[PDB]
């Protein structure tokens, strides 16, 4: 019957059409009765300065507490009552507000999205409430080691730059951000040239593209308004930060090298590589037979409770590494075996490994388009980051292009002999010396 080879083509293409104000509209039309649509803004914490660190988040919090055309109660009521799900987020280089509804309400939804970004109420009284609320989330998130770890990673990896900032921001900034700065942030960042209306589900690109024209109004006069501002580059620094608390149960360790950035084709190879090392946690059933060598040893020697490879990309940079959670007394062997595998990558990867890694990555990419939201997310981000959309058919070619030899050269290129960034949190006494860790960056 129909092969993978083809199912990859019969996938409806993604329509993309820009509007006179810079905003871009895109969508993948499907048979689905239900759907998802939202705006993927190219704004984050990276764009924040040191005095307004956290605005994009304080904003993410007031985006649903009402607009000017319709206050809180009404806004919420109006959304719930139509069974639509309104959610969103905000990262370092990307904010996004999307809605999950029946393909029917598609246009009344677009209106809503629009009203949120353009006319957020910012009620003086709602701000004093979201203040204590964020402050709470900071104290709750402060207990999520995995997070406290990646922020610390960034904090040192990109020390002294924008990327070295938390998306939530400082405590002072939360305690003092004004109706002003919040206002300002929105007017300064939530602009058409930097926004993408992505739609996935049973919707007609046309109807959609029209609703935008109708509610995504306002035309830019000067040239500065349709100028997508380039960001001052963030400098990577091989270093480490160690937050010790022997009172914590397990320790967290995250290590990484600098990545290329969305654009670079290598990101593909890098991912194939990461697929070879994979991930693990105490509930994987494969246990001692898992294909990933690191997971294997992790089991044979009870090295860690869990571990994961990651290839976080950014516009002009990135972090390539791994993060494991382990008992205080096995941190060392774990890190040792882990780095080893990295070195194993730049020097002896087999075609056997890549062949498998590719199949895992293929199923991995397909797995990221399992629903309207995920498909919408991919579109919203693809345009914003890659400058268009890359079909699963395209990807799959780039992946079949990778061979062992290619993986070695690419990993060597980014891993071998580089000085990494290290973030350690908890009862980390056993893991030690940047020097020793630095020397683990070379020789098989």
């Amino acid at each position: 019957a129909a092969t993978y080879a083809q199912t990859l083509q019969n996938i409806p293409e993604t329509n993309v059409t820009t509007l006179d104000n810079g905003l871009r509209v895109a969508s993948e039309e499907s048979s689905q009765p239900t759907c998802t649509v939202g705006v993927w803004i190219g704004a984050g914490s990276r764009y924040e300065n040191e005095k307004n660190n956290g605005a994009g988040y304080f904003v993410e919090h007031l985006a649903f507490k009402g607009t000017k055309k319709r206050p809180c109660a009404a806004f919420e009521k109006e959304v719930e009552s139509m069974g639509a799900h309104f959610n969103g987020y905000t990262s370092r280089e990307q904010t996004a507000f999307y809605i999950k509804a029946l393909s029917k309400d598609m246009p009344k939804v677009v209106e809503l999205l629009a009203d949120v970004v353009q006319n957020c109420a910012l009620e003086e009284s709602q701000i004093e409430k979201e203040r204590g609320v964020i402050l709470q989330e900071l104290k709750e998130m402060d207990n999520d080691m995995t997070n406290v770890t990646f922020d610390y990673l960034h904090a040192t990896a990109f020390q002294g730059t924008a990327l070295a900032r938390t998306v939530e921001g400082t405590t002072e900034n939360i305690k003092h951000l004004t109706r002003a700065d919040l206002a300002s942030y929105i007017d300064t960042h939530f602009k058409a040239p930097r926004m993408v209306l992505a739609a996935a589900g049973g919707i007609s690109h046309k109807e959609l593209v029209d609703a935008a024209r109708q509610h995504f109004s306002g035309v830019s006069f000067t040239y500065k308004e349709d100028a997508v501002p380039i960001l001052p580059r963030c400098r990577f620094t091989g270093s480490e930060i160690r937050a010790r608390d022997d009172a914590l149960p397990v320790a967290h360790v995250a290590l990484a090298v600098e990545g290329p950035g969305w654009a670079d084709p290598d990101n593909v190879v890098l991912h194939v590589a990461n697929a070879i090392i994979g991930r693990y946690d105490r509930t994987f059933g494969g246990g001692k037979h898992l294909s990933s060598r690191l997971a294997a040893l992790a089991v044979e020697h009870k090295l860690c409770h869990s571990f994961q490879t990651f290839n976080t990309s950014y516009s002009d940079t990135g972090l390539f590494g791994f993060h494991f959670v382990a008992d205080p007394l096995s941190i060392d062997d774990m890190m040792f075996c882990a780095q080893g595998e990295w070195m194993r990558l730049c020097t002896s990867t087999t075609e056997s490994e890549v062949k498998r890694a590719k199949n895992h990555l293929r199923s991995a990419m397909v797995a990221q388009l399992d629903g309207t939201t995920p498909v919408c997310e991919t579109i919203g981000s693809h345009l914003l980051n890659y400058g268009r959309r890359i079909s699963l058919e395209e990807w799959d070619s780039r992946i079949s292009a990778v061979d062992a030899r290619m993986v070695r050269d690419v990993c060597s290129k980014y891993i071998y002999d580089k000085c990494p960034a290290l973030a350690a949190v908890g009862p980390i006494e056993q893991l030690l010396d940047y020097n020793r860790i630095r020397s683990g960056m070379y020789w098989i």
Binding site: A1, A2, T3, Y4, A5, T7, L8, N10, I11, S31, Q32, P33, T34, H61, F64, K65, C72, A73, E76, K77, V79, E80, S81, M82, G83, A84, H85, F86, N87, G88, K100, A101, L102, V133, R282, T283, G285, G286, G287, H289, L290, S291, R356, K358, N359, H360, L361, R362, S363, A364, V366, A367, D370, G371, T372, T373, L392
Partner: protein
């Protein structure tokens, strides 16, 4: 091109096959079965749980080794999900690798060897798999709930009780498999495949054949309350009453009474106005919390009520408020519109639930197992809105009238006893 049908043959032995090609670049096959903690006896408790984890052990055809390296060699996956009364062994993979990933699926479900050592080596794992789970108190009160609300079958825990860790035998397994994994209790669903093939397979290979083996004992209703003082700053409470059964006529009524009382926020960090329960509880308490409509539909029974996470001090006012708000709705406190809004949220929720290849396969499955038919999407619609403003208010009554059984775990100091509501 791409679009049409969903065949559903029903072979000799009573085995079912439910195919649906949707030309996705990936297939997702699964074996649904009528099994679970519900068929366990004081004598073999937890044997179900273990069987779930035992999926990767050597089979008569594939070795513990080849099963993992094999499914992994093709970027495939393999897992087992289960309720107290249903078990599902499904595998995903790129299209071209279905036949391959199948060998193991077939082997794992029909030809297990449960070798003593392999089994014994595995058993201590229940200690872990269970500890990660219990991290969410959400799951603590639910195990105990089902216990206090029942006397058997469903009153059985989903996670092997502690004392039985390491005491389960290779026999208990086999027997449990021989007795429950029988053709007439199994269904071979499957997305991204042509019905002809899934059929061809099911035939020549599925060799566990006809039967009904062990019969789940009719689920009685106890109506007791289990409380767990543990110090947590957060008290979780679940007060429910006998509800509807799977497919029950009365069923959909609650599903709607559920969405009328509110069930799971739709606005990130938002207040639920369309949620009477939430809204009412909000007026009663001051500090952070959450309260929702709890609804379970089981083969021969069901549960229904609310569930509240609140600060230990404001537990009283929260659970009480959660009550009046259920009574005030059991007395015509339901607008013709509330029934209108809920009717949609349910239709919506239902629909979105099937965007996930996992969600779709689970829908197609559940039916092809507890029926043998696929209820068209417009039929279920006509079934949901065909619920009177009364049916709903009545469901609400059945709650206020029936014998309740509560379950709470936290610093229950200020929490109330079932006989105080």
């Amino acid at each position: 091109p791409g679009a049409e049908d969903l065949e559903i043959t029903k072979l000799p032995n009573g085995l079912i096959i439910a195919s649906l090609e949707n030309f996705s670049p990936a297939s997702r096959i699964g074996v649904f079965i009528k099994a679970g903690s519900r068929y366990e006896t004081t004598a073999n408790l937890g044997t179900a749980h273990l069987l779930r984890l035992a999926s990767p052990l050597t089979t008569k055809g594939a070795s513990s080794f080849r099963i993992t390296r094999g499914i992994e060699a093709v970027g495939g996956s393999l897992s087992v999900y289960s309720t107290r009364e249903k078990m599902t062994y499904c595998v995903e993979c790129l299209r071209d690798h279905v036949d391959t990933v199948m060998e193991y699926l077939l082997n794992v479900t029909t030809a297990p060897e449960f070798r003593p050592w392999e089994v014994t080596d595995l058993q201590p794992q229940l200690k872990v798999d269970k500890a990660v789970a219990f991290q969410s108190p959400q799951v603590g009160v639910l195990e105990n709930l089902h216990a206090a609300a029942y006397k058997t079958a469903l009153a059985n825990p989903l996670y092997c009780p502690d004392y039985r860790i390491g005491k389960i035998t290779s026999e208990q397994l086999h027997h449990f498999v021989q007795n429950n994994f029988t053709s007439a209790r199994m269904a071979l669903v499957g997305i991204g495949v042509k019905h002809s093939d899934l059929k061809q397979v099911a035939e020549q290979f599925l060799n566990i054949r006809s039967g009904a083996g062990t019969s789940s004992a009719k689920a009685t209703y106890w109506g007791g309350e289990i409380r767990e003082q543990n110090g947590h700053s957060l008290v979780h409470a679940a007060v429910v009453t006998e509800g509807a059964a799977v497919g029950s006529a009365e069923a959909n009524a609650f599903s709607v009474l559920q969405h009328v009382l509110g069930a799971g926020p739709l606005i990130k960090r938002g207040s639920s106005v369309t949620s009477k329960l939430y809204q009412g509880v909000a007026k009663a308490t001051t500090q952070p919390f959450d309260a929702s409509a709890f609804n379970v539909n089981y083969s021969d029974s069901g549960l229904f009520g609310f569930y509240t996470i609140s600060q230990a001090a404001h537990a009283g006012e929260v659970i009480r408020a959660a009550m009046n708000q259920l009574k005030a709705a059991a007395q015509g406190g339901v607008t013709e519109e509330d029934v209108t809004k809920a009717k949609n949220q349910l239709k919506a929720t239902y629909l979105m639930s099937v965007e996930t290849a996992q969600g779709l396969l689970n829908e197609i499955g559940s039916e092809a197992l507890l029926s043998g038919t696929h209820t068209a999407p417009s039929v279920v619609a006509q079934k949901i809105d065909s619920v009177t403003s009364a049916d709903v208010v009545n469901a609400a009554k059945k709650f206020v009238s029936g014998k309740k059984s509560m379950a709470a775990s936290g610093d229950l100091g200020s929490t109330p006893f079932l006989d105080e509501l």
